[PDB]
């Protein structure tokens, strides 16, 4: 079917735009090609073929512990979060594939190197540069304590992660 | 030694057949309480006030009565929508009524660590905190599909008697608490 | 940070839950009075005759929706 | 072409984006008079929602049925004393209403 290779080759052109090894891609294309035997993925929405699609680039993103969030593949997966978790829920109770958790330690780290605190750039000046090293250590710390201390728990992870590198920015010099 | 907590059913929804065709039309036009809209959906919600339930009343006679808190109050609130039917003008009857599904809520009153509880039982449950703050628990035994909280709140569903409910949350309780 | 632990150990001595969970619930889950009684098999024809519509009301809904 | 007539935007930082999931509904609340009369119309009507939605031009037809059942899942015995007592279909008593609540609210703007 055209609609199969075309979702499969809009999965492998994901990929290479998250630029993920080729481990991954082959992954990605097994799992998709495994919950293609389904009838109700099978002949279902193309929102939902797309979902599909996220949602197997996410499983396969998590069955090596790489950090990725949701909203990252919803952005360039061009979907809503509502539908979204509807076809995950959907998918994974008619699959039951491994979901490992999303490790808090690398997702604190993919989101602490997004930031542009450690080179000093003509907008933000020298002092509000601060060392990548000690400040990704104080954040880890920060987010153990949170998880240690029932924070993040029943609640998103990436606003508790903004809210501890944000007070490691502060406590590196609070004058 | 038992638990020493016992479910609070919140919800009981069971189909019940009434054996002819019905008139949705006339069946809205004739009562105060009738909702039913045939652009937006087929099904005539009746609404009473005994035990407080919700009926989906349907043309080929099958209709789903909800929110009820027990068996027995069920079947009071779909045989008093029978007899309102009736009185519709209808030959309406009360014939192969059955629990369909039953939703509960307990509270075990201490917190649980949904990460542990996951990496505990994945093949039993599963857990994504980025969607909804409950982790889905499918219980091994009745199809009972379990929401837990962070808060030590658990609700339960998909069972047909009370006694499944019950016996889950005998069998999840020493689980949770370890 | 430097020795968070016992310090997070001492401020549990002395359980993170929502705000609106920690305002001194003291009733907790009230226990909701059982009300199983069910009659013979029904109530009575003046609550069908209170739910049916009434000629009037029929007319006049059928003015407004016209 | 173009003339000027759109500002370019500095958005979608290609790092990463996170997600929302509440986009549109951000509804407005009630006052004591509109859940007089709103419990006025239940009385007179019933539990039809479209009729509901027709006679109340300015709130919408889900948030008239989101209120009914935050009604019946909180105040019970209000929803049966509704139910209990009845009022014969008035229109243009009703549109005069209307706009007196009309003017209620833009006092409430003005205030």
């Not at chain 3, 920690?22 to 009230?30: A, G, Q, T, V």
């Not at chain 3, 059982?34 to 009434?54: A, F, K, P």
């Not at chain 4, 004591?32 to 709130?59: C, W, Y």
């Not at chain 4, 243009?92 to 703007?109: I, P, S, T, W, Y």
């Amino acid at each position: 079917s055209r609609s199969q290779q075309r979702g499969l080759r809009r999965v492998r052109d994901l990929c290479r735009v998250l630029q993920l090894p080729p481990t991954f891609e082959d992954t990605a294309v097994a799992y998709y090609q495994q919950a293609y035997r389904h009838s109700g993925i099978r002949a279902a929405r193309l929102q939902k073929k797309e979902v599909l699609v996220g949602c197997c680039v996410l499983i396969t993103c998590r069955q090596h512990n790489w950090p990725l969030t949701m909203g990252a593949i919803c952005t360039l997966l061009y979907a809503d979060l509502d539908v979204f978790s509807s076809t995950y829920m959907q998918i994974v109770k008619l699959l039951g594939l491994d979901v490992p958790s999303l490790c808090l330690a690398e997702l604190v780290k993919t989101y602490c190197s997004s930031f542009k605190l450690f080179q000093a750039s003509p907008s933000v000046p020298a002092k509000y540069v601060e060392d990548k090293e000690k400040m990704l250590s104080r954040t880890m710390q920060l987010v153990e304590l949170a998880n240690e201390t029932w924070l993040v728990t029943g609640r998103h992870p990436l606003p508790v992660i903004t809210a501890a590198t944000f007070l490691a920015w502060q406590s590196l010099q609070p004058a | 030694e038992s638990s020493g907590i016992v479910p609070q059913l919140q919800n009981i929804v069971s189909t019940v057949n009434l054996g002819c065709k019905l008139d949705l039309k006339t069946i809205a036009l004739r009562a105060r309480n009738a909702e039913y809209n045939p652009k937006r959906f087929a099904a005539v919600i009746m609404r009473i006030r005994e035990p407080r339930t919700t009926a989906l009343i349907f043309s080929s006679g099958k209709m789903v009565c909800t929110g009820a808190k027990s068996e027995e109050q069920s079947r009071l609130a779909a045989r008093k929508y029978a007899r309102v039917v009736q009185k519709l003008g209808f030959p309406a009857k009360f014939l192969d009524f059955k629990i369909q599904n039953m939703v509960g809520s307990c509270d075990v009153k201490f917190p649980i660590r949904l990460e542990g509880l996951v990496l505990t039982h994945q093949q039993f449950s599963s857990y994504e905190p980025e969607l909804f703050p409950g982790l889905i628990y499918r219980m091994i035994k009745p199809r009972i599909v379990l929401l837990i909280f962070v808060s030590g709140k658990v609700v339960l569903t998909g069972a047909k008697v009370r006694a499944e409910i019950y016996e889950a949350f005998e069998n999840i309780y020493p689980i949770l608490k370890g | 940070l430097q020795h968070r632990q016992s310090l997070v150990r001492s401020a549990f001595r002395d359980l993170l839950l929502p705000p609106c969970m920690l305002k001194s619930p003291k009733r907790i889950c009230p226990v909701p009075p059982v009300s199983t009684v069910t009659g013979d098999e029904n109530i009575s024809d003046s609550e069908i005759e209170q739910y049916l519509r009434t000629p009037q009301e029929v007319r006049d809904f059928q003015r407004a929706q016209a | 072409c173009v003339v000027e007539e759109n500002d370019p935007i500095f958005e979608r930082g290609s790092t990463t984006t996170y997600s929302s999931f509440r986009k549109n509904y951000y509804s407005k609340p009630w006052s004591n008079k509109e859940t007089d009369m709103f419990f006025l119309a239940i009385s007179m009507v019933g539990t039809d929602f479209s009729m509901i939605g027709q006679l109340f031009p300015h709130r919408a037809r889900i948030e008239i049925k989101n209120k009914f059942k935050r009604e019946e899942k909180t105040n019970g015995w209000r929803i049966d004393k509704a139910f209990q007592e009845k009022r014969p279909f008035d229109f243009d008593f009703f549109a005069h209403l209307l706009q007196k609540v009309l003017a209620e609210e833009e006092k409430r703007k003005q205030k």
